[PDB]
Design a protein around this ligand. Structure first.
Ligand SMILES: Cc1cc2nc3c(=O)[nH]c(=O)nc-3n(C[C@H](O)[C@H](O)[C@H](O)COP(=O)(O)OP(=O)(O)OC[C@H]3O[C@@H](n4cnc5c(N)ncnc54)[C@H](O)[C@@H]3O)c2cc1C
Ligand SMILES: CC1(C)c2[nH]c3ccc(Cl)cc3c2C[C@@]23CN4CCC[C@]4(C[C@@H]12)C(=O)N3
Ligand SMILES: CC1(C)c2[nH]c3ccc(Cl)cc3c2C[C@@]23CN4CCC[C@]4(C[C@@H]12)C(=O)N3
Ligand SMILES: [Cl-]
Ligand SMILES: [Zn+2]
Length: 664
């Protein structure tokens, strides 16, 4: 495909604002339609996942309009994604060669547990991702992911309107076929709002809960909650002075300690780029995806920036997520003038390993515009008691949220977005095909499982979060109990069998393994014990011994009962194939390398000889995956064979679940 500059030139020719050039790519036009089947409030990641999955699940069945008040895709925290998300992107026609042009490579999750009373001591928990010929995970800049999904939506019959706001004061949502009149304006000041007559409203307004907050007060869980404060930093090419042994930048790294943890995410940023130019670059990437352009013949990220006149840079997202029962000194003026900056810098100097770590990074001022050097958000976790009703349902953060840890926000949250998407087809058809009372009753009964799933989802995630947090109070419980159990219960078994048809059903059965009985049993034992130790104290060594012994007794039987074959010793650096902790073990598979030219992390596969980020040809044209223990040529061919082909679904075979096999 020859690159086209359609939007850059259209924007200049008509002197178009950001919202106008974006809305000009809509299939039905730049102005709002008088009527639609579904109106989606909000074009965050979940509103767009919803609209994309709905249209892809059953094309040309629903007219869908998405309303977003930002003038262009705005900044969001929430950058780490997991295999289920990549698989969804691949099922929607965008595989790793194209996604890696826009987003950062992610190869697994790594944890470092810092001893508070023994400053300098630490342990770790390492895990790898997958070979390049299997899949990739992604670190995504959210203005770019939401641009990507906006353009892809517009190319699949979905209209997306930026710079437009749902007026929840005058909007009417009812049952009865085409019962909704969604009022859309350019803002409070706008005297001439438009109405979209529609059947179904989707609340995808995130934590603002702009519609469902009208139906039930926000619900908070018992006990402590969390606060987060964060900023953006340079990303060094040379990672060798990082004070943690075997550190690698292409993991989602976790620096864990009694009060909480720190995320470290390496990702590319497109900030400074005009929106029209970005639209042209994304459109070009999609055309290359459609045409199946091989990765080595696809321009590198930096080459795309030159082609389309973009700004491109490597940044590190670094933030704290800590309990809100931490005692702070009253006066923190020595660490800055803003509260976020003050508590960030205060926490860094409380741990010598954090300060030595942060000394590798340079602060970036105002990456996302003025006032954005530092961010703070208080009291993270919540749940919406009511997530559906006549004429509407809620998805994503609008249903509830817990914590950044293990990234449930996007990767678990998309189970609601995609299930709601699948359900929207019968919901709309019912309303077109039955009298009003029976339509309302049938739709209500159809959504009972959706409501019940959401109701129990966030509490399970909250228990999962507390489980990890309390275990992070000790450098043995963190890696040997909490991390081990999260990955044993939550690894995505049979992900290679999922397709568009079965995606939502698979996704709602995952929950990061937080529903697995043996997981909840260990989690409850640890929480019950550790929550009785005041935060400012060290856990008694006998308590750690007892919890570790309890966890290991439950583990051996649950592991024996799993019938899923997996080279555990190759994936978890510190564990053998039966998930026993091995004190000296360092052997692991190696799926990635760092580009010597630009520092970008790359996936090892023989058909990708050039760095996908800067284009530098491979340091030597023969670095291949290292399997430890080794795999034969046939076993390696077999692994790849299972993941290149996506299966058309048979309506008869039952879905294989991601969670471990029941002992029964
Ligand atoms: C500190 C922190 C770290 C996190 N880290 C991660 C991570 O690593 N990985 C992960 O997966 N998740 C992470 N999360 C969670 C993640 O940020 C959220 O789960 C996710 O961004 C929510 O997506 P959403 O589409 O539901 O809502 P949002 O992305 O918040 O989008 C809601 C949208 O609604 C729009 N809107 C609001 N009102 C109106 C209106 N009246 N009319 C029109 N539009 C409107 C807004 O403009 C916005 O675009 C993190 C969260 C926090 C707080
Ligand atoms: C299942 C998978 C998506 C996964 N999900 C994880 C969750 C937590 C942790 Cl710690 C690791 C993983 C992995 C690594 C895996 C293990 N599988 C071995 C055969 C194919 C595959 C897929 C992939 C692979 O190559 N790497
Ligand atoms: C298991 C089932 C009740 C189910 N439970 C779901 C929950 C959420 C979502 Cl999104 C979908 C489903 C389905 C669809 C299924 C899948 N099964 C294939 C063989 C028989 C059956 C039963 C049924 C079938 O025909 N359709
Ligand atoms: Cl993660
Ligand atoms: Zn490079």
């Amino acid at each position: 495909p020859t690159p086209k500059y359609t939007f850059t030139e259209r924007a200049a020719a008509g002197n178009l604002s950001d919202a106008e050039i974006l809305n000009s790519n809509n299939p039905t036009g730049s102005e709002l339609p008088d009527e639609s089947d579904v109106v989606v409030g909000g074009a965050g990641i979940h509103g767009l996942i919803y609209a994309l999955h709905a249209s892809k699940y059953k094309p040309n069945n629903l007219k869908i309009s998405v309303i977003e008040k930002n003038t262009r895709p705005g900044y969001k925290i929430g950058e780490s994604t997991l295999p289920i998300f990549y698989t969804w992107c691949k099922l929607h026609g965008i595989s790793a060669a194209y996604l890696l042009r826009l987003f950062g490579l992610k190869d697994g999750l790594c944890f470092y547990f810092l001893d508070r009373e023994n400053q300098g001591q630490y342990t770790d928990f390492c895990s790898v991702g997958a070979p390049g010929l299997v899949l990739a995970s992604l670190q995504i800049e959210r203005p770019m992911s939401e641009l990507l999904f906006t353009i892809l939506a517009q190319r699949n019959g979905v209209n997306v309107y930026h710079g437009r706001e749902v007026d929840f004061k005058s909007t009417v949502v009812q049952g009865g076929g085409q019962g909704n009149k969604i009022a859309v304006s350019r803002g409070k000041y706008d005297s001439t709002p438009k109405t979209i007559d529609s059947a179904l409203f989707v609340d995808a307004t995130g934590r603002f809960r702009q519609f469902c907050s009208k139906k039930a007060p926000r619900h908070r869980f018992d006990g402590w909650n969390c606060n987060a404060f964060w900023g953006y930093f340079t990303a060094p090419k040379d990672e060798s002075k990082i004070p943690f042994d075997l550190y690698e930048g292409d993991h989602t790294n976790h620096l864990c300690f009694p009060e909480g943890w720190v995320w470290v995410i390496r990702l590319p940023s497109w900030e400074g780029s005009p929106i029209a130019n970005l639209m042209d670059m994304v459109t070009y990437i999609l055309e290359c995806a459609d045409a199946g352009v091989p990765g080595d013949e696809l321009p590198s990220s930096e080459e795309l920036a030159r082609m389309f006149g973009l700004k491109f840079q490597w940044v590190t997202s670094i933030g704290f997520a800590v309990r809100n029962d931490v005692k702070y000194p009253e006066d923190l003026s020595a660490y800055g003038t803003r509260e976020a900056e003050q508590k960030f810098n205060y926490f860094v100097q409380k741990y010598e390993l954090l300060q030595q770590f942060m000394s590798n990074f340079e602060l970036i001022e105002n990456l996302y515009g003025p006032g954005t050097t530092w961010f703070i958000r208080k009291t993270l976790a919540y749940q919406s008691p009511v997530v559906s009703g006549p004429g509407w349902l809620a998805i994503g953060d609008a249903c509830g949220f817990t914590n950044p840890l293990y990234s449930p926000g996007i990767n678990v949250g998309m189970s609601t977005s995609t299930w709601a998407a699948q359900l929207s087809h019968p919901i709309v058809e019912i309303g077109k095909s039955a009298p009003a009372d029976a339509a309302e009753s049938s739709i209500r009964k159809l959504l009972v499982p959706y409501d019940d799933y959401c109701k129990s989802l966030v509490p399970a995630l909250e228990q999962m979060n507390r489980f990890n947090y309390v275990c992070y109070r000790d450098t043995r419980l963190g890696p040997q109990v909490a991390c081990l159990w999260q990955f044993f219960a939550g690894i995505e078994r049979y992900l290679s069998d999922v397709n568009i048809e079965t995606f939502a059903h698979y996704a709602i059965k995952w929950v990061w393994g937080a529903m697995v009985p043996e997981y909840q049993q260990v989690a409850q034992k640890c929480i019950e014990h550790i929550e009785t130790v005041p935060l400012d104290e060290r856990l008694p060594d006998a308590m750690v011994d007892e919890l570790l012994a309890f966890s290991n007794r439950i583990k051996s039987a649950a592991v024996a009962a799993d019938d899923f074959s997996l080279r555990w010793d190759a994936i978890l650096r510190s564990f053998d194939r039966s998930l026993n902790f091995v004190e000296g073990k360092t052997s692991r598979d190696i799926y990635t390398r760092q580009c010597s030219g630009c520092g970008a992390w790359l996936q090892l596969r023989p058909d990708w000889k050039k760095c996908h980020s800067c284009g530098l040809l491979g340091t030597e044209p023969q670095t291949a995956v290292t399997f430890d223990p080794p795999l034969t040529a046939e076993e390696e061919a077999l692994l790849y064979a299972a993941w290149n082909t996506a299966p058309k679904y048979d309506p008869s075979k039952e879905l294989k679940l991601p969670t471990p096999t029941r002992p029964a």
